[PDB]
């Protein structure tokens, strides 16, 4: 009943040697009742990927603000968004609504295009950006996402790699959480590609 | 409590929606028709709070309606459970929210395919073979998972409706006075108009 | 159901090298009232252990009894009372931390901070703590109410694990517990100037010091403090 | 959270812890809690984090534009006028609570900012949960006509009594020494006392572990 | 909190402690509670920090538009805009003034603003958690025309009361004398009021 | 929480899953649901875990004391209403649990007891119990024959669970099975949903609302 | 209002063995954002080789354990000297628990010794004696950082056999003591990384059929 | 809310129950008998609080027994209806009080009349010609004011409760699963087993 | 209520102002707020009357009993039995009393008994929602060994400025002294003591 609890719902993303990686589960519910099996919560504008925990009405809200949003952003500067300044345009959203903000946790995965070097980014409801290197967790089961990935990450992980980790991270941490689950689909992200994997879980 | 049920075969959806009106101590209308044609291949069902409930179909409905008009164009399920859900979720962070919750099954006539959205009074959209609002759905959505198939004819599709049907009617608190059932096809709405004493 | 009326703050404690000191300033408080000031809030029982206490005084006071009439009963019938079958900080402990816990699960507390400090009669240093729900711990140092927040910072830069407790002197142990105690005066608006300090020692024994003062107090730059932003003169 | 404010005989520094934390969880082990407010006027908070980061950045901006309007270095009395100004306006709901220190024309300047918006003068300051361990500090062992080295030990040395001693603070230490001579040096992790020992086994996975249902490539252009 | 303002045949002299606490933690033990409004225009603050320093602030600009218009405005006239912020914002404010100020027709002058927003001119004024601890020792020792040094004994000495027995109030003792001469500012330290 | 125990031509199915939660999180994945208070005698247990498990262990007890007492194993009918008389002195202490006593005796036949912390006792054919009752009870009343076979009804039951297991987010880890005959409970082991879920889709093409 | 019960942190973890078994817990007690010990032990022998924990709010977790060594005591008295099996504990434990079922004790408590057979077995209960038997049990502040990480590396779930697509799983296997303290000295430094409650020091009880062996290891005293 | 009606016709009273167990969003039971007998000739039907119903019924259906065998005589209805009055009227001081309602039915041999007595949870007893506890007695009580005449046959009151039930079928908000109808007169207490289509 | 006991060279004197409230209305006017438990043991009451009385009461029963078997009870005796029901029923009173005795031995004794139930001995107590008011003049004015006219003008003095700002105090002054004399009951009056 405290929003953030109603649909349930992880993103993680982690950062390895020239490349990074986003997973979401796939579960909407509304309480116990598990309402829908292919609610994806990581989106992208260009080579950005935005995923959202948290209230799935301001999720879609906020994808289809990001989009709206991008996509001007495009037209006017003749160029793509980059994480970075993504970030920003995220973070002053928030922002804008301090005082009835949208109940979600966003998380930013992407590779710089003129630089090459991988981008995570986190943020509370209000726009608090957490600018960690290694890894970003939010959702219901962000404790166990925490604990996950304090004990199996380690830097300049292989892409094949990371995809072990990110999975297994994921995967361990929605088998603690009620709400989470249902599903996952893990992003690799590397300058040049994109894989998408949809990965086997339990299914209760 | 209200009954929305919504359930997606191979060319068709299905919606059934309950027949009783109730305040406080007496059912006052068996008959009740909880359903608005958007558009000659899109249908709405509604349940929630007294009075919002129809204000706010039709709302939609005139929307949809000045819309085609305009264009000389029916809007597809998609665009049209879109426009709903962006209503739904202004709503509910306004003064006094609409506490709607609705099914839109459509027919897409360039996809040649059938959709069921279900959208919640929140403004959560989400497109899935079968759908309910309320209580009914701690029942039918389990019911349906074992005897649901996505090959289904609109006939077999009659047919798990009756027993989603008859499981609410064994199980749920309250007497809502049966269903009235419509079928969204290629054609169009029609309406079952001999559900209850089948 | 209850609510503490008359208090008094801090209790600030550390092991050294051969026993153990504790403070408590001679204040008790009503509200904001600074009402009382020649409190007492260290008591001596035997001579090898000072129970000091914080919070309500009326509890306080009630305590006070309890450990007096328990010196009486373990005198009884005990040829031995001074030598082997004196009491024992550990035993003086127990007890309390038995009344506190038992009192708590009543619903009906002392509503208290207690530090029990001693020596063993082996020689072993005892520096525990109870409060009003029955939570123990021991640690180098202890401190209660505004005490834990103040006084333990710096009191552990001295002790900060057991294998610095043979390093320290009684001098340097001093020397911090009566810094700590000017730095709560400093910044602690329930405290007093004045305070009692004892050291119990395994060779010196008991040695209770009463009516010390807060003294190198640093006030004077205070004058160079104008307005509260921009305001010059 | 442990911030200081301590001015010495040229100028003024300010330190911070590098936690931030939600709830009883450690999100961010090293974030950035100095903030600049204009090139030689800089700030740390505490509280609301995106509150104090925000309202940094507003008066940061217009601090900026007054600069350029009136061809003048900015004055720190200035960023704690909008601020306090600011904060006051909003009756408390930002919150902020800061520590606004810097050189300018005038001299050098150490402030502290209440999310209500009062403020208070200082030779010496603190905020936040490991503020009480770093005053403790700071009381023992500040002095009149200190040097830019005794200000940045007594600075790095009270928010270490907070690292140490309050569990919402830990990690690091960041520094930053304004000075009425020369420019503002930001020290980043000046003291890094909190390495994460070794691990006891690595965790990589032999590959394919993570049982696949389907597989597809994401189009990222038009 | 303790403050007070005091006439004398001079002038005015301005007093307060200087402790600010949240709690019971001192925030500040140095605080300056003596607020420059104009020249000679003093008041000290009680109640809401955040509160009294913004109203200080605007009645501050009022008296700085007022002189750049018509002079230097009474004390009167200062104790007016005071309670015009006080009293119309009563409801989200918590603001406890007393102004005091020098002018040359009227010499020394005491206006208290409590609560509410009324105001009230007096001999001499006392405000603040501490004062309730001092009214029976002021009443008993204030005389009318005091001389400086007599003024400067007496906000010491129910100050150092004051101090004695509210906990919010202690630190050091401030002074602002306000006469002919000048402004003339002075600390006192708990090592000298203390002992009295 | 799901638990359920039907009536049937041959005898009693009962079948529970094994997922333990507080709150959100998941305390455990391999509790034991089931009590097996005597050879013909089980209790099933749904809301707060050591209110069920003491008191049917206690339960248990009492029904041994019968035994001695009587020269004679305790009827269900008794054995439940033990239960249903202790948790009735317990009313508004804020006991919960969701229960139900299946068994077999001579002169009743096999008997389904349903007993809550409410003091509500109802003897019947058909009983779901937990927050996943309702989708257990949409799978089971929809298939539900009398003459179901031994083999069937065992499998409807597994079923019902999945069901359960499936939506219910307090629902899940593994099927416990049990059998109950003139003769009478024999286990028919566990079963995990983590494999189960699968192998029933595969197998009998249900479960269309999952992607893969 | 007077509130019963308080909050000292602190986690605690146990994993059985094939023929030993270990219980772990920081030493670290805390209130509120205070540290009021960086030693305390939560860990017991309890005689008859069983080891003993109950975590959350220390009072009525030294009340549980003081009692149930009674319980030890007076098992000897009253059955000739029989020792206690593991599962007998278990058993009264939870009539310990259960006796407060209507002021419980606020504990999450975790028991490890030997089976009759001579296996590894460990026990945990909640705060009002509902108890399983367990392969391994994270309980206490940190639990959900940790418990997902021990049903990956103990219990090896979700992991599959490379290759077999996903439809062999890898194999349970019993660990050693050396690979077992392994993941608990990993558990725990991720755990304080993470948690603020979580630090100082670990200390492990192992349990074999020659007794009960400690061990120590400092951690992160932020 | 169970539904729990009686009617006195002239030579018998009829106890007309609900059947349904209802807890949360599940009717666990459709065949629930609320009914217990007191005597050969004296009946009792109750609803109320989910445990104290059954409770309360079997305790005074214990007490009844008891005083037959000890006396080897059977209490008048009036008598037994006194008897449960003052147990609920002890009961409402007492520190958790039967939360029950309920319908005395009884023929009275030395009389040669029937008897309907009315008790709520408070102990209020009062004799009616006809009587309802819940919500159900809102549609009944009136119904009965019009259809009731005091000199019906047995088979004439089973249609004027045949009415009464169909009323509440038509206009109750809850499902109560039809009734189990009981019949007391000189011949004792008997069951009408075809009711619920009869 | 105004109430405060003072020890002087030849023994103590009790003090207390005449008035009792229920609001803003004056119940009594007149009242006698001093209360023997003994032939020189008094007290002085506050907070409920009802409460107070019972206590009064009860310890002047036990006294009563004490004389008869073991002969004069030591003030402190008295003090240690009014603690003892404050403390052991501090959860259903809302008492604070003040102590004040005389025997040839220990001379004159001060006990004050604040809410809590706690016992402190002292050589002066001021209580009662008048005596905030005057922490500081009392402070100021009170000396050890003082002759029985200048303790009665310290009490005089000192209750006048707490009947002149607590609107809870007032009426007429009484006091009891307390010496190997003698007891002797005071009264004062508003038309002398006003104009102190
Ligand atoms: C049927 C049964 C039998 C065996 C195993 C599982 C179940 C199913 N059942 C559960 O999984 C329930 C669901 C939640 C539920 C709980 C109670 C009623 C209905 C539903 N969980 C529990 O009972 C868990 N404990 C707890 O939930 C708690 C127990 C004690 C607590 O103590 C808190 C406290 C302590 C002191 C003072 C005040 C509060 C907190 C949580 C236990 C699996 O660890
Ligand atoms: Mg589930
Ligand atoms: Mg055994
Ligand atoms: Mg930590
Ligand atoms: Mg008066």
């Known amino acids: 009943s405290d929003p953030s609890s109603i649909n349930g719902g992880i993103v993680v993303a982690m950062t390895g040697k020239d490349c990074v990686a986003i997973a979401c589960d796939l579960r909407l519910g509304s ?103 290694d890894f970003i967790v939010s959702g219901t089961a962000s404790d166990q996402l925490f604990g996950m990935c304090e004990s199996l990450y380690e830097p300049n992980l292989e892409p094949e790699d990371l995809f072990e980790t990110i999975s297994q991270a994921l995967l361990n941490a929605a088998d603690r959480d009620a709400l989470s689950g249902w599903g996952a689909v893990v992003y690799i992200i590397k300058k040049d590609e994109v894989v998408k994997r949809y990965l086997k879980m339990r299914q209760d | 409590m209200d009954i929305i049920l919504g359930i997606r075969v191979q060319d068709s959806v299905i919606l059934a929606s309950s027949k009783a009106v109730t305040r406080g101590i007496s059912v006052l209308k068996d008959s009740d028709d909880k359903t608005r044609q958007l558009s000659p291949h899109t249908l709405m069902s509604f349940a929630g709070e007294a009075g919002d409930t129809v204000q706010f179909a039709e709302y939609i409905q005139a929307n949809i309606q000045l819309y085609s008009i305009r264009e000389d164009y029916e809007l597809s399920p998609q665009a049209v459970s879109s426009f709903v859900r962006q209503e739904l979720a202004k709503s509910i962070r306004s003064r006094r929210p609409y506490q709607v919750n609705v099914l839109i099954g459509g027919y897409d006539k360039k996809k040649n395919k059938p959709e069921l959205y279900q959208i919640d009074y929140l403004g959560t959209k989400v497109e899935l073979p079968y759908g309910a609002h309320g209580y009914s759905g701690f029942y039918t959505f389990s019911l349906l998972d074992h005897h649901y198939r996505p090959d289904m004819t609109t006939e077999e599709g009659l047919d798990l409706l009756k027993l989603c049907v008859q499981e609410l009617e064994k199980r749920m608190p309250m007497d809502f006075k049966g269903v009235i059932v419509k079928i969204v096809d290629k054609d169009g709405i029609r309406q079952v108009d001999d559900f209850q004493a089948q | 159901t209850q609510q503490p009326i008359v208090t008094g703050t801090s209790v600030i404690s550390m092991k050294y090298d051969n026993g153990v000191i504790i403070a408590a300033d001679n204040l008790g408080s009503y509200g904001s009232l600074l009402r009382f000031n020649g409190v007492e809030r260290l008591i001596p029982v035997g001579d090898n252990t000072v129970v000091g206490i914080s919070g309500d005084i009326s509890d306080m006071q009630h305590i006070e009894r309890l450990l007096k009439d328990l010196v009486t009963e373990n005198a009884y019938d005990n040829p031995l009372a001074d030598a082997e079958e004196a009491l024992e900080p ?42 009003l729900l029955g939570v123990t711990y021991s640690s180098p140092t202890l401190a209660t109410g505004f005490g834990a927040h103040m006084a333990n910072p710096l009191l552990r830069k001295v002790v900060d694990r057991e294998s610095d407790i043979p390093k320290t002197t009684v001098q340097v142990a001093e020397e911090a517990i009566v810094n700590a105690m000017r730095v709560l005066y400093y910044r602690d608006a329930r405290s007093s100037r004045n305070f009692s300090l004892a050291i119990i020692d395994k060779n010196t024994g008991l040695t209770f010091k009463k009516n010390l003062q807060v003294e190198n107090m640093k006030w004077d730059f205070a004058k160079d403090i104008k307005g509260y932003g921009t305001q010059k003169i | 959270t442990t911030i200081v404010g301590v001015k010495f005989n040229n100028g003024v520094v300010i330190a911070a812890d590098t936690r931030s934390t939600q709830g009883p969880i450690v999100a961010d082990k090293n974030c950035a809690k100095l903030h600049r407010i204009s090139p030689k006027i800089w700030c740390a908070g505490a509280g609301t984090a995106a509150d104090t980061e925000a309202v940094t950045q507003l008066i940061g901006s217009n601090i900026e534009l007054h600069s350029l309007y009136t061809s003048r270095e900015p004055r720190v009395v200035s960023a704690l006028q909008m601020l306090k100004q600011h904060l006051f306006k909003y009756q408390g709901h930002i919150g902020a609570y800061l520590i606004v220190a810097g050189v300018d024309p005038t001299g050098s300047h150490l402030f502290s900012i209440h999310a209500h918006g009062s403020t208070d003068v200082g030779y010496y300051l603190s905020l936040g949960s490991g503020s009480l361990a770093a005053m403790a500090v700071l009381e023992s062992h500040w002095k009149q006509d200190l040097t830019k080295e005794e200000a940045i030990k007594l600075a790095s040395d009270a928010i270490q009594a907070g690292i140490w001693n309050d569990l919402g603070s830990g990690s690091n230490v960041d520094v930053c020494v304004m000075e009425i001579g020369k420019d503002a040096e930001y020290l980043r992790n000046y003291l890094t006392p909190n390495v994460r020992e070794e691990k006891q086994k690595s965790y990589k996975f032999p590959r394919g572990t993570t049982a696949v249902l389907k597989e597809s490539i994401v189009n990222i252009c038009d | 909190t303790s403050i007070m303002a005091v006439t004398f045949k001079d002038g005015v002299i301005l007093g307060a402690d200087s402790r600010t606490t949240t709690g019971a933690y001192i925030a500040n033990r140095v605080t300056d509670k003596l607020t420059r409004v104009h020249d000679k225009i003093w008041c000290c603050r009680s109640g809401s920090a955040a509160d009294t320093q913004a109203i200080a602030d605007i009645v501050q600009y009022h008296l700085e538009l007022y002189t750049s218009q018509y002079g230097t405005p009474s004390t009167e006239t200062a104790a007016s805009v005071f309670k015009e912020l006080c009293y119309e914002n009563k409801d989200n404010l918590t603001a406890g003034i007393i102004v005091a100020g020098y002018d040359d027709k009227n010499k020394g002058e005491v206006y208290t603003i409590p609560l509410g927003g009324s105001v009230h001119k007096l001999p001499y004024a006392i405000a603040g958690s501490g004062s309730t601890f001092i009214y029976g020792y002021c009443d008993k020792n204030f005389r009318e025309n005091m001389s400086k040094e007599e003024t400067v004994d007496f906000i010491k000495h129910s100050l150092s009361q004051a101090i004695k027995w509210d906990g919010s109030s202690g630190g050091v003792i401030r002074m602002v004398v306000l006469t002919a001469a000048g402004v003339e500012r002075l600390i006192f330290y708990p090592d000298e009021y203390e002992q009295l | 929480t799901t638990t359920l125990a039907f009536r049937f031509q041959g005898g009693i199915i009962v079948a529970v899953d094994s997922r333990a939660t507080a709150g959100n999180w998941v305390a455990s994945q391999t509790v034991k649901k089931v009590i097996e208070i005597n050879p013909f005698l089980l209790g099933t247990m749904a809301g707060g875990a050591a209110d069920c498990q003491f008191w049917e262990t206690w339960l248990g007890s009492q029904c041994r004391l019968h035994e001695l007492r009587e020269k004679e194993r305790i009827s269900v009918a008794a054995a439940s209403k033990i239960l249903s008389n202790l948790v009735y002195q317990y009313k508004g202490a804020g006991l919960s649990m969701g229960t139900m006593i299946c068994g077999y005796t001579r002169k009743e036949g096999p008997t389904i007891y349903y007993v809550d912390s409410d003091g509500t006792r109802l003897k019947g054919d058909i009983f779901c119990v937990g927050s996943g009752q309702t989708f257990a009870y949409g799978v089971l009343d929809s298939n539900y024959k009398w003459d179901l076979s031994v083999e069937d009804a065992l499998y409807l039951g597994k079923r019902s669970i999945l069901a359960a297991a499936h939506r219910d987010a307090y629902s899940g880890g593994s099927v416990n099975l049990y059998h109950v005959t003139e003769d009478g409970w024999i286990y028919h082991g566990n079963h995990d949903v983590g494999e189960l879920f699968w192998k029933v889709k595969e197998e009998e093409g249900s479960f269309n609302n999952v992607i893969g | 209002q007077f509130n019963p019960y308080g909050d000292n942190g602190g986690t605690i973890l146990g994993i059985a063995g094939e023929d030993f078994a270990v219980l772990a817990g920081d030493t670290r007690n805390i209130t509120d954002y205070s540290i009021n010990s960086r030693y305390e032990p939560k860990v017991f022998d309890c005689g008859d080789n069983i080891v003993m924990s109950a975590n959350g709010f220390a009072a009525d977790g030294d009340a549980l354990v003081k009692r149930f060594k009674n319980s030890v005591k007076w098992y000897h008295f009253d059955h000739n000297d029989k020792k206690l099996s593991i599962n007998s504990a278990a058993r009264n434990i939870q009539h310990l628990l259960y006796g407060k079922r209507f002021f419980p004790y606020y504990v999450h408590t975790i028991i490890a010794g030997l089976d009759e057979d001579g296996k590894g077995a460990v026990y945990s209960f909640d705060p009002v004696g509902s108890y399983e038997r367990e392969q391994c049990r994270a309980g206490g502040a940190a639990a959900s950082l940790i418990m997902p990480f021990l049903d990956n590396q103990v219990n090896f779930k979700n992991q599959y056999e490379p290759g077999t697509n996903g439809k062999v799983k890898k194999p349970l296997k019993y660990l050693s003591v050396e690979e077992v303290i392994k993941l608990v000295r990993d558990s725990f430094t991720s755990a304080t990384e993470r948690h603020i409650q979580v630090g100082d020091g670990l200390e492990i009880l192992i349990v074999t059929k020659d007794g009960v062996r400690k061990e120590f290891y400092e951690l992160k005293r932020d």
């Open chain 1, 31 to 133: 309480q116990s009742l598990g309402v829908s099996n292919k609610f994806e919560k990581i989106f992208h504008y260009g080579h950005v990927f935005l995923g959202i925990t948290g209230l799935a009405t301001d999720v879609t809200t906020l994808n289809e603000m990001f989009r709206y949003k991008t996509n001007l952003y495009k037209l006017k500067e003749e160029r793509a968004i980059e994480p970075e300044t993504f970030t920003q345009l995220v973070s002053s959203s928030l922002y804008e609504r301090r005082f009835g903000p949208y109940f979600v946790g966003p998380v930013v995965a992407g590779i710089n295009s003129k630089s090459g070097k991988p981008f995570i980014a986190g943020f509370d409801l209000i726009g608090c950006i957490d600018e960690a290197k």
């Open chain 3, 90 to 131: 550990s035993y003086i402990f127990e007890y309390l931390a038995t009344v506190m816990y038992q009192r708590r699960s009543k619903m009906n507390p002392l509503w208290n901070a207690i530090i029990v400090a001693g020596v063993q009669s082996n020689g072993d240093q005892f520096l525990r703590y109870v409060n």
